[PDB]
Amino acid sequence: GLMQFTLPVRLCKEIELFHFDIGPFENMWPGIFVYMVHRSCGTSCFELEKLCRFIMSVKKNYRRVPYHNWKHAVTVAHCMYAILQNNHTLFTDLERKGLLIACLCHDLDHRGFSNSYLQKFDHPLAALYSTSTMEQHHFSQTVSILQLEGHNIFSTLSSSEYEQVLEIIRKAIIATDLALYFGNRKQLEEMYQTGSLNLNNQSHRDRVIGLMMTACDLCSVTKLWPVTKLTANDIYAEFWAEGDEMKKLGIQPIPMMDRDKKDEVPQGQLGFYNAVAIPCYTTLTQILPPTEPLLKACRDNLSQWEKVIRGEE
Ligand SMILES: CCOc1ccccc1-c1ccc(-c2nc3ccc(F)cc3c(N[C@H](C)C(=O)O)c2C#N)cc1
Ligand SMILES: [Cl-]
Ligand SMILES: [Mg+2]
Ligand SMILES: [Zn+2]
Numbered sequence: 001g002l003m004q005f006t007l008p009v010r011l012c013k014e015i016e017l018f019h020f021d022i023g024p025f026e027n028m029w030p031g032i033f034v035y036m037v038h039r040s041c042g043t044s045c046f047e048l049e050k051l052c053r054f055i056m057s058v059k060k061n062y063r064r065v066p067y068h069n070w071k072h073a074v075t076v077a078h079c080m081y082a083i084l085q086n087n088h089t090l091f092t093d094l095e096r097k098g099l100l101i102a103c104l105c106h107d108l109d110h111r112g113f114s115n116s117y118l119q120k121f122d123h124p125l126a127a128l129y130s131t132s133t134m135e136q137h138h139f140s141q142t143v144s145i146l147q148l149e150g151h152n153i154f155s156t157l158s159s160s161e162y163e164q165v166l167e168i169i170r171k172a173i174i175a176t177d178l179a180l181y182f183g184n185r186k187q188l189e190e191m192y193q194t195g196s197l198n199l200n201n202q203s204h205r206d207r208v209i210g211l212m213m214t215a216c217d218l219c220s221v222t223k224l225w226p227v228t229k230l231t232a233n234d235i236y237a238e239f240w241a242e243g244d245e246m247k248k249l250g251i252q253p254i255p256m257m258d259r260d261k262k263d264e265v266p267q268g269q270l271g272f273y274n275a276v277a278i279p280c281y282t283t284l285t286q287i288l289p290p291t292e293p294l295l296k297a298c299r300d301n302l303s304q305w306e307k308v309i310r311g312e313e
Pocket of ligand 2: 111
């Protein structure tokens, strides 16, 4: 337990900043996550042997898809770490524990296909889970992995704390369903503006955690431009294959997933930054001022997308 995980100097410093990229060395991503848990939560929050075994079963259960893979899991967990570390005093011991795990597990056993495509294919998961289809499956997958022998990192929690953390994680993971984002941010905006927002109201905490989850999930848009751009290529690798699969079912895909509408990528990013990303980080900055660097980074990458369109790159 006197076994403080460390990183090389450049990582030890940059990991603290919102725009840290976890880099291309797959084998360093568990260490980076353990570092983040130990700093965010303590060396005491999880039995190391159980946490490492959990991490490795989570990793095994992410597929080798272009975007919705283990690198995304660990990237989304890093963003949550940076929030939790810039707003240390706002969050319960159970929230700091649960949310880092929520993020790591939030896309477990993703197949590189949208809730839409599952429903149009008529996949058994769309019959088991009518809305937030993949999101309910990811939560299901997380509980299953916690139920494996030697995997229950929540072992030491009381019957109460255990049901609380699983409930934080369940709401956390459901909130990553972007179809639910729009409603949640409208409600948080109005509540903030009418001065009615109350972090003592569990229902309100839930909504705020929901926005954090969206903000971590979308955090490719707050990175250095070359990360933002090279992640977008991975994103279109999934979207276009899905469009191909839609076409095989006899269905015109939406332009966002039609590789024949490549030419319009810059404009679609602009719409997304305006419709989702900018409002998401704007509202998050309002409620959690120290998350301002996410908003500014997003605005910078909006501006790089504008430059693409103007053929200045
Ligand atoms: C949804 C999650 O995706 C992400 C996550 C992170 C960063 C970025 C993304 C991401 C992925 C794709 C887009 C996108 N690409 C297109 C490419 C061509 C095209 F014709 C249309 C679109 C397009 N449609 C615009 C919006 C419309 O017509 O409403 C969109 C949209 N939205 C924008 C952002
Ligand atoms: Cl598959
Ligand atoms: Mg997801
Ligand atoms: Zn995700």
